[PDB]
């Protein structure tokens, strides 16, 4: 219950995040992934505030990837708090 990897193949991943305490209001979730070492250009996609699960595809086998979730608030009150949740995975 962080961020966590529900299930994974060496090419695909299933991610889950607990649906935290501010949905009112977060509008969207920016989800990022890139090979943990820098060089590859970072990939991103968004999902609606009501989603607790997302899919990350096209990964390379036995490679270390970094995943991050950014919560984007609708203009006006947070909850001036955030942090981005992170996890590192080997396929």
């Amino acid at each position: 219950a962080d961020l966590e990897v529900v299930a994974a193949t060496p090419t695909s991943l299933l991610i889950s995040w607990p649906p935290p305490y501010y949905v009112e209001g977060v509008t969207v979730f920016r989800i990022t992934y890139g090979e943990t070492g820098g060089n590859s250009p970072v990939q991103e996609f968004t999902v609606p505030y009501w989603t607790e699960t997302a899919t990350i595809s096209g990964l390379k086998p036995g490679v270390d990837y970094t995943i991050t979730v950014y919560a984007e608030m609708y203009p006006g009150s947070p909850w001036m708090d955030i942090q981005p949740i992170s996890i590192n995975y080997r396929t």
């Binding site: 968004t46 989603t51 609708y74 203009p75 006006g76």
Partner: protein, 283 residues
């Protein structure tokens, strides 16, 4: 005169527009472009066309992309002639990124409005899943230039290609007849946003559990709209406007149906939709 709770609603709706609609499109960035590094051509099955149907829906909505640079330069894309199929989808990955930018702002719009946060999550999800396309199409009409057939989106510009055809063929496509007829009305900023509220809070939408709680809100904004016209527009000539706007939203609901259907046929050939489009669209 317009009553204080109606005045309060418009004030809110107008603030949501201002806070969540970038008329300059200045934050729409890192979008894909054609010829800048999708589905492989079909050589040549029996059960496809479907391909011919998708082609028949897409050709009527053919646009050219114009990208003005800060420096003053102008990059301009003219799409290919049809050939079949593959050529026909060259601009759809850009449009996916365009819909995704638009959707963020729509969701943000709804989230700002009090009468939306107050509603239960399960019903919030149902309204945005059903009205996102419509809200976005109303917003697109605001930047439409009926004279030039262009959607002026700041640095970006999407101008419809010559039908030849002519305007006879052009308005035969519901989507374009809508923008052209809606533009003619020459609505106020207050009207477009009320129109956006009435489209958002629609009880008829599949998935809506708390039907009464939503239908009462639609009716409120509808009265707020009808009242606004009776206060801020010379009533003799602008008597029939409220019913006209209401009819446009009925057509917008049916365009949405036609669109969901067209999108499923497109997605059947190649998955063009982004994760946000999928969730807002039933995937």
């Amino acid at each position: 005169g317009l009553t204080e709770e109606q005045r309060m609603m418009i004030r809110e709706l107008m603030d949501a527009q201002m806070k969540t609609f970038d008329t300059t499109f200045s934050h729409f960035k890192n979008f894909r472009l054609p010829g800048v590094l999708e589905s492989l051509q079909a050589p040549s099955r029996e059960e496809a066309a479907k391909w011919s149907q998708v082609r028949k829906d897409l050709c009527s909505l053919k646009v050219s992309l114009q990208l003005r640079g800060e420096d003053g330069s102008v990059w301009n894309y003219k799409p290919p002639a049809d050939s079949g199929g593959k050529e026909i989808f060259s601009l759809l990955p850009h449009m996916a990124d365009m819909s995704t930018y638009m959707f963020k702002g729509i969701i943000s719009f709804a989230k700002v409005i009090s009468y939306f946060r107050d509603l239960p999550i399960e019903d919030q999800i149902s309204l945005l899943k059903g009205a996102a396309f419509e809200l976005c199409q109303l917003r697109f009409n605001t930047v439409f230039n009926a004279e030039t057939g262009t959607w002026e989106c700041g640095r970006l510009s999407y101008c419809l290609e010559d039908t030849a055809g002519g305007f006879q063929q052009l308005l035969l496509e519901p989507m374009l007849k809508f923008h052209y007829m809606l533009k003619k009305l020459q609505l106020h900023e207050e009207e477009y946003v009320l129109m956006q509220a009435i489209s958002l809070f629609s009880p008829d939408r599949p998935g809506v559990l708390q039907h009464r709680v939503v239908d009462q809100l639609q009716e409120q904004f509808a009265i707020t709209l009808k009242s606004y016209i009776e206060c801020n527009r010379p009533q003799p000539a602008h008597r029939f406007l409220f019913l006209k706007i209401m009819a446009m939203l009925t057509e917008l609901r049916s365009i949405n149906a036609q669109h969901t259907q067209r999108l499923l046929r497109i997605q059947d050939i190649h998955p063009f939709a982004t994760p946000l489009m999928q969730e807002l669209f039933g995937i």
